[PDB]
Amino acid sequence: SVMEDTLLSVLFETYNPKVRPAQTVGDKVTVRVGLTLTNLLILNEKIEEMTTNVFLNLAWTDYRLQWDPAAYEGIKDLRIPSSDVWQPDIVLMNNNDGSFEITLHVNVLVQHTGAVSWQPSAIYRSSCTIKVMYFPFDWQNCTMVFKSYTYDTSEVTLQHALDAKGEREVKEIVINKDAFTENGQWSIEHKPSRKNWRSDDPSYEDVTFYLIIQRKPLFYIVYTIIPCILISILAILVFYLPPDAGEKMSLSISALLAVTVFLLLLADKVPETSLSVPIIIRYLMFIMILVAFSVILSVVVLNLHHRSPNTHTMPNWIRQIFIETLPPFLWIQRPQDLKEAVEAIKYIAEQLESASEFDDLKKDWQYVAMVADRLFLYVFFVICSIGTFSIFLDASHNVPPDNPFA
Amino acid sequence: SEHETRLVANLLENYNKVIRPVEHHTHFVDITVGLQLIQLISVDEVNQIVETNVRLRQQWIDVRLRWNPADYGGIKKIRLPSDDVWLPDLVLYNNADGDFAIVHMTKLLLDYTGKIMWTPPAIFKSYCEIIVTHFPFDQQNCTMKLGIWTYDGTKVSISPESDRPDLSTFMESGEWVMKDYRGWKHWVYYTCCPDTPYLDITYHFIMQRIPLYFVVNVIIPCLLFSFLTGLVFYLPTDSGEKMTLSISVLLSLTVFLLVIVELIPSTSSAVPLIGKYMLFTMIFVISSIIITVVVINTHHRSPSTHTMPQWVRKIFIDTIPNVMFFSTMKRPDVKSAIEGVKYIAEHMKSDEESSNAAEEWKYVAMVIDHILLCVFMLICIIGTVSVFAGRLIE
Amino acid sequence: SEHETRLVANLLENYNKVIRPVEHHTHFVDITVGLQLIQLISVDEVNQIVETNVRLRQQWIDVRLRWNPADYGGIKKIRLPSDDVWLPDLVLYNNADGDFAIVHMTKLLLDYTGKIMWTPPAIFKSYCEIIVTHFPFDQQNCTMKLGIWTYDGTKVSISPESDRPDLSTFMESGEWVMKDYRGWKHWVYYTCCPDTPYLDITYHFIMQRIPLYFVVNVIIPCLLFSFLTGLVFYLPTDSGEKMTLSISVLLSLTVFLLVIVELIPSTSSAVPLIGKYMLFTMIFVISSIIITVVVINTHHRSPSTHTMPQWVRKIFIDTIPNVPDVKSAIEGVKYIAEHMKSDEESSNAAEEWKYVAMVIDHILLCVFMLICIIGTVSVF
Amino acid sequence: VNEEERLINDLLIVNKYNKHVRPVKHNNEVVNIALSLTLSNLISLKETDETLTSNVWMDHAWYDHRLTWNASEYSDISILRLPPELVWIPDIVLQNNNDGQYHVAYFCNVLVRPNGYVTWLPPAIFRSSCPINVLYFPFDWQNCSLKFTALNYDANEITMDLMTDTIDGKDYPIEWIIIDPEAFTENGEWEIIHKPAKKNIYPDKFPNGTNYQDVTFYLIIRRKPLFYVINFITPCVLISFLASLAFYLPAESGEKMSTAISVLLAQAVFLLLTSQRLPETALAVPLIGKYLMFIMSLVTGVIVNCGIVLNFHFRTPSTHVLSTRVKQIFLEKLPRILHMSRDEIKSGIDSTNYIVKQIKEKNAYDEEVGNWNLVGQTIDRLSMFIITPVMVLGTIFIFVMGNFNHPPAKPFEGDPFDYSSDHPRCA
Amino acid sequence: NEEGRLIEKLLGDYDKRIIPAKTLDHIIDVTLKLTLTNLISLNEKEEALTTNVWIEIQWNDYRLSWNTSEYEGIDLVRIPSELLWLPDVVLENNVDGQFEVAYYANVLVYNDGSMYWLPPAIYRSTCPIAVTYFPFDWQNCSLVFRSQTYNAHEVNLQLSAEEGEAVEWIHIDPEDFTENGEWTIRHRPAKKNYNWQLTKDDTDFQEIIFFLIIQRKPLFYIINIIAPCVLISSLVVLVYFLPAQAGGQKCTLSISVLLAQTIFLFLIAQKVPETSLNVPLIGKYLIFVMFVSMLIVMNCVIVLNVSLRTPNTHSLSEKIKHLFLGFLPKYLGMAPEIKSCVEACNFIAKSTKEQNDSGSENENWVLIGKVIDKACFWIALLLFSIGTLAIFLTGHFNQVPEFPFPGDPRKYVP
Ligand SMILES: CC(=O)OCC[N+](C)(C)C
Ligand SMILES: CC(=O)OCC[N+](C)(C)C
């Protein structure tokens, strides 16, 4: 028969996959752990879970799996099913669901010197703490913690994987260009790898891989930011409509309704984490409060416009502060039967004079309203511009650090 | 190791994993059970199911799995798959949409004295009744009941490792603060087997909800719309937009009520705080709309049909505006042509009288508007306090 | 019993479940396949996937599994796990979201003459194209193609148990009515093995949708807003709420169109009739909005700017509705009189414009009434 | 008795068949595996999570010298069926899946022949990661891909290939996805334009690795846009016409801003629905998304212009000055360019003079208000004539550009071969 | 430990594929009891009832008997259920593929061969929802247990007996039981049902059904859905006091109330199932108030047309004016210079008189609109009140039946 079958029969005569390959009692099996990312599928912020398609580059040395290739027709290496050989239980301790082990269970590669290399593929759903302060113009620092579930430091010794030539250690996530599909929403800025030790327990040792991925905010800018900028532009416009036209309140509360709808429909995107408030949510709340104040001031302007001498008397201070001082600054400055017939015509003239004085005071009230809404227009324009510029400047300044801390 | 290989072959050669690890059948297996909370995954309020990532640390002593280390090259601790040895049948009593027991079956530590240290992972999706009385500032007491299913206290006994669950490596959830946590052990006599008690350990976590997210995304817009509810009384009737503002506030509160229902369970044990607030502000908006309709109808009372009552005038013109001071309220054939002049003058006088009466009606409506403005501002400022500060004081 | 244990030990002592149950390899296993629909779980219209709970009754004869009852205490029927005997690999060809084959592996009856009656439960999520042409009053012809995968006609043959699937234990779905059901057997030559035919049985169910739920939730509000569309014309221009009503109706119809879109698959095989009705009523609402802004602009025509055409005047007025200081004071009085005359004639021309607006509104209302009455006639 | 039992026993138990050993006579040899795909139903393509769910048949074919028998010696048995768990099979897996389903769904029997030829045709449901190019949505075409690689062996031990068919005694490779007319169903939303099959070898990798080779099946499928045109594009276009139509409303009725804002809100609702229907990728803004953004910006411009018209209409001579330049450019030049439609007695006499003066002032006020109204009307007319053609041209240009997004005639750039089933490569 | 020797003796020659009948025609009696630990949820959308129950199955296996004197007084052992024969009692009423129990706990085996298997289970059982009186409804959900493999000639399903009498109800242990908070268990009967269409050699001939007559607690739905819907739908009554002028916005208010009712319809559609057998009670109320709102919008259009019409467009007939002014209000409470000056003054007076006379008919039309508004206000108020009261009265009178079975005088309670 094939000498491969003979070699497999000889190797696994007394092999036990439940036993560590410590040649001497007390030895530690040096296990090299590396990661090869093929696709970063999604980062679900709602459940704080990142799922990736990865290859686990594992390597160790088993003294039992040794043979002389010269005595077996030049067989330098074999491909053995992964269940037939001992393997360290390198699992994802950071997994959000109950998916610790790998998925594919590919064959291991056993060489005649005893070196075993195993590269299983798996879809791993790890848990990532989401820093939501600068969402969506932000970056996330998502980790994958890999260590043997059972064997501690006294039994295995985790290390870093080697490169293709093997002369050095690679301290980063290996990305194969021929198989990597770049995610359309996240760009991998830094992908370092480091070994962490915890104090107060020397038996702990793990290898963690970091993905400092920066979100591309074009989707949220197009579908949420620009419509809200248009709505705020409308909110500013409501202090330019005449109070005579009965469309001021309709515009103001329609803007408020639009902002509320955009805030509510954003709830399925923003995570439920309560540590901080996302900067887009802060912007939406700023616009909502500004539009609410615009509604209140539009109500005030409409109330001032419809006043009359029959309802209100003009205060001295209001007139002095709104007709004299503000319009210079705002450039809004305004520019027998004959006896009975005679008595009737005189009464008509008296009524016309009274009506003229009445509408003169009414026009004074309307002019006070006009000055008030022009001042509110300038103030709201300045406040909205400054707030929007400051918020977006702070969002733009948020960049990942130049060097990771690993 | 050849030594470890010989040891594992010797341990499982005549080992039966069906039988309890006791020297005599009258004795009981002493098992030390400890819960180690790792991560609070989610708290589903609608389904009343809490998902947690735990490590169910269990220890017991198996006499059949002891060896002398000097006969095996000095090995003192080995590791075996859990499927090769007897395991306690620890079951989550209050499981809901999950697995009742351990399914992963990872390996376990085993020293030379027979002591077994098994720490399998588990995602416990457990039912716990969610008290929505003080939502979203609520505090939930979620429990996890663990007990041996088929063995009673005289056969297999458990004991908590410590009075509190282990949270040394607990990952911060970012939505709940672990205010307290403890574990109590009970002897329960069930109707199925009343002769012997069945032991269990119930780990309860007192979780306090961080309310910032719900305050920002729900409570603040509702507060804004409640503020704008009473603002319609400062809007003059002549604008013809009072109904627009009121009905827009009503539609906003309807949409937010639709939002709230999907966030809380449909349980009827107790009315929620936010539900009471929503009902209060809904009644507030309905009352404001009704009063607005009353004011608008008062503003358009035709003087030719509705004469001004004496008491209405006395109340709303003479006394009340004089009382308030915060607002600036007022406190030949040529004779045919002459006959036409007389007719148009009399028409002018009658129109002036009618306009004066209409002005009186509008003034009454405005006074009613100011009174209702003050009353509704006071109600809006005291009702929100009465709803929220009762819980915020703690 | 001791007899049954001895019998089962004897039957499977040298039994190989790989090999077909034929005396000679040239023969074929005759398998009687029937379906028993237990409950239609749901019909996912958007995903075009129908999940059903079924019992896949299968019968065949195994020569190797026969015994004489007199040698075993008189037992004539036993039950064995399905994993211990040869099983046909019935595979759902059009599986879309579940398992191609049977996965439960329940026990099967075994007669002393070798007859095997196996009734394993399964849930079949099968893809069937959903004809949305007459939604929500439509009927769906959803099929379930069951055939033997790896064996051809000359190796294992199947035959339907009866011309119709069994529905004796079928429970009422509450959303579909089982109008008709029948099974057919086919001989299909695939490209993989063109030299031999492969047999299959396709069970089709004709399910008529019960339309009460969609009538209540969708059709009735749409009819309400469609009726409110015609009340725009009767609404006077001076109220200033014509465009409010028209816009509200249009937005409501758009929202319901979006809901209907969410309720149907995005396949473009055929436009739904409810979709056509929504599109036509939106077209009608848009046309009424155009006509009502025309009538609003007409009502506000300043007579000092727009002169009344003669043809408009006749066609909307005559035919269709029939179907020192003393002399300065005197000069001021004359000026007042002539200005009053000018105002009177300007108001007369404005009233002519308003009359044209009213008659345009009336003829539009009559057109809407005609559309409504012919629609109610076509309903009858 | 059945001779198949004797033959199977002789093949497996007597010969001591090992399913964990490659079927080669020497270790240095290679095993040729022929792979083919048979698409029976394109189940769905969910753009929200970039998943292509397909119902396919995987055709494997390889030789195994351990499964050879003399047919005449075994009573003329020409074919056998064996379960996969009894014989060696190449573990071809889908590398680019979204879930844990690397393998096929059902492990059907393999078919072996006396010459050693083994054919395995299991059905499968695969959810591969298809990057969605949303640039020309909904008139788009997607270049989805299924990547199959043999991770259990390296290229020196297993060589993947494309299955070969024979016509007129000549062998040609099957470089396409096989579609069986009697077992294929049209999706109803996606039309299969191209379906090439390629064998990829990466020269920068080493032959002794598991990433040296793969076989990829591509599905270049275009979306039939009739559903989206009828249900989304048409109401968007119809509602957007009302925005430019709002200029025709007179300023007297308070429904100008109401109509414009309502159109804006409807456009925003459609934009939110489109965002719900599309993934959150930032590679490019969709065509319909760009159209909606353009329409919303133009409607916002219409709202601003309506506010300006309302401000100009309600101006009063007691609060503003009708300047000469504005008058001469808004009622002399622009309306013509746009072709728009065109003692007791002494006391009584003093009272009459006063009332005549008041009527004169009222008439002058009315004339000023009328001039402001004409200014507002001509601004409305100018904005309509400058915005309506922009809307029409933008809509027509966007939809023509979307409609002309035909998928390319050849599936791969620089490759003259069309990868069509009717044109074999070497036959 | 003698348990090892005993279990190795019992399972040494034991196979789990054989029903433990002593002789031919011996029927194994299998008794069932259900212990409802917690009614988790009743998902209306998929018509699934999720319950956390302990199902107690008892039968007799003669192969599993031993003499206690030979095993040091051991009379009870625990054997994993995977190593023993089971009667395969499954839930035939499931919504998914889960027929068997979730955990497969150990089986208590007594020295006389009695088997006591009590595994925990989470059962998702179908039950159609009677939406006719939502949300005041009561659901008659049930769980059907049948032997998946054996028939009535091989096993005999029965209800367990405690003190010589059958149980015939879902047992509820006072320890470890939690109220659902939305559903109250009014009745929990149990009986063995025969399907007489089949013969006693078929597997589905005999069943054991545990019923659950659960009544919904409607306080949550009243406070969160019904009361806001009623308060909003009462605002269409207010549209008759708004003026019929350009302001007031009668049509705006009525249309917006109709829109709010549509929002509530969408909200309720996410609660009730998609089944088409009946219209929900609150759905009927919503349809009724939608029709009332549409009629009120039509009436607003009518009164706007009547109030805003002028004598220059319509003719005010004396019949209509008399009918709406004397009948309905009776029931309801409601020298060339001199010549030119004379001609100019006469023209001014005539024009003023004509203007004042024309406005008189406008006021008459306003009064007609007011009278129609008052009458239609009373009609609409009466209609809305009667509809609301009748709907909620027939919801309130949806009493749970006194007996678990209408034709059975038994109470089926412990
Ligand atoms: C004894 C048996 O098998 O049932 C266990 C019941 N429980 C969980 C109440 C102890
Ligand atoms: C021959 C084989 O194994 O595949 C069968 C494919 N089918 C069902 C289309 C004939």
Side-chain angles (χ1 to χ4, degrees), chain C residues 91 93 147-151 188 190-193 198, chain D residues 57 81 108-111 113 119-122 180 183:
Chain C
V91 173
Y93 283 68
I148 284 189
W149 198 254
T150 61
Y151 291 103
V188 187
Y190 299 99
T191 63
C192 58
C193 299
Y198 279 85
Chain D
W57 303 343
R81 275 82 176 186
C108 78
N109 299 335
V110 305
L111 278 69
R113 296 163 181 81
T119 51
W120 186 34
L121 189 51
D180 200 320

Side-chain angles (χ1 to χ4, degrees), chain C residues 160-352:
Chain C
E161 182 174 342
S162 56
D163 71 321
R164 313 190 64 183
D166 191 13
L167 265 80
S168 299
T169 58
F170 177 74
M171 56 183 61
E172 306 298 326
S173 184
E175 207 175 3
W176 302 86
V177 177
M178 208 61 55
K179 197 72 62 179
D180 189 64
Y181 41 87
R182 192 159 283 97
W184 298 108
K185 176 191 168 185
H186 311 79
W187 296 258
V188 187
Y189 292 87
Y190 299 99
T191 63
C192 58
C193 299
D195 66 333
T196 168
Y198 279 85
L199 277 54
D200 75 309
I201 302 179
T202 301
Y203 293 110
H204 58 84
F205 305 100
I206 309 298
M207 296 169 302
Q208 183 82 29
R209 190 185 298 271
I210 307 181
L212 174 63
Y213 173 77
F214 291 100
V215 158
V216 165
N217 282 249
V218 174
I219 295 186
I220 284 184
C222 291
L223 286 178
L224 290 177
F225 287 115
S226 174
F227 184 79
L228 290 179
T229 304
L231 296 179
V232 173
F233 302 145
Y234 204 61
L235 199 59
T237 312
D238 207 5
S239 73
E241 310 188 38
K242 223 165 176 171
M243 288 301 302
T244 298
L245 173 57
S246 297
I247 276 311
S248 299
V249 170
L250 177 64
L251 295 183
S252 302
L253 286 187
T254 297
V255 167
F256 276 104
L257 178 59
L258 265 301
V259 171
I260 294 174
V261 166
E262 295 288 341
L263 258 48
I264 59 176
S266 300
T267 63
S268 67
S269 301
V271 186
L273 274 187
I274 182 62
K276 265 178 173 296
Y277 160 73
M278 288 274 89
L279 256 299
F280 283 170
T281 191
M282 284 193 52
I283 284 290
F284 180 75
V285 168
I286 293 301
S287 294
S288 78
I289 287 182
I290 298 298
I291 297 300
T292 200
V293 303
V294 163
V295 92
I296 285 177
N297 177 269
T298 298
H299 186 274
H300 291 124
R301 293 295 263 273
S302 54
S304 63
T305 305
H306 308 260
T307 61
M308 184 61 177
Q310 184 69 23
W311 59 280
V312 186
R313 168 125 54 182
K314 52 176 296 183
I315 207 180
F316 287 121
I317 297 170
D318 309 327
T319 51
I320 290 185
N322 288 15
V323 175
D325 303 329
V326 194
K327 89 274 187 173
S328 74
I330 297 299
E331 167 262 350
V333 167
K334 299 177 187 180
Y335 142 83
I336 292 168
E338 65 88 14
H339 197 72
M340 288 255 289
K341 178 184 181 60
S342 177
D343 292 356
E344 194 272 345
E345 61 89 12
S346 173
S347 300
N348 181 271
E351 207 284 326
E352 214 95 65

Side-chain angles (χ1 to χ4, degrees), chain E residues 196-258:
Chain E
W196 297 106
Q197 300 183 357
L198 280 70
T199 59
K200 68 194 311 300
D201 55 76
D202 294 354
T203 66
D204 305 333
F205 174 68
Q206 52 173 10
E207 340 171 357
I208 291 184
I209 314 179
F210 299 98
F211 299 96
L212 277 173
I213 314 297
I214 45 183
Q215 183 182 26
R216 193 195 307 266
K217 309 180 65 177
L219 187 72
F220 170 81
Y221 291 93
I222 281 181
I223 282 164
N224 286 266
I225 296 176
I226 290 181
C229 176
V230 171
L231 291 178
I232 288 182
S233 298
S234 73
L235 294 183
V236 287
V237 193
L238 276 319
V239 317
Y240 301 98
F241 304 98
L242 300 173
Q245 304 178 352
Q249 307 180 325
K250 306 159 60 77
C251 294
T252 300
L253 173 59
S254 54
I255 283 298
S256 296
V257 173
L258 179 56

Side-chain angles (χ1 to χ4, degrees), chain B residues 330-387:
Chain B
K330 188 188 67 60
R331 324 194 196 281
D333 289 356
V334 198
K335 298 183 177 181
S336 63
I338 306 182
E339 290 180 356
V341 172
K342 294 174 185 176
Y343 293 159
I344 67 177
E346 290 178 3
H347 182 66
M348 257 65 178
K349 185 178 180 180
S350 66
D351 290 0
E352 179 70 25
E353 176 265 357
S354 180
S355 71
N356 223 25
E359 171 264 354
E360 290 181 355
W361 274 115
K362 298 173 184 180
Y363 180 79
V364 169
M366 171 175 298
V367 169
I368 293 181
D369 268 350
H370 278 199
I371 292 172
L372 267 305
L373 171 65
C374 298
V375 166
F376 274 39
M377 283 295 107
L378 189 58
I379 285 178
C380 174
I381 296 186
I382 64 109
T384 60
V385 167
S386 177
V387 171

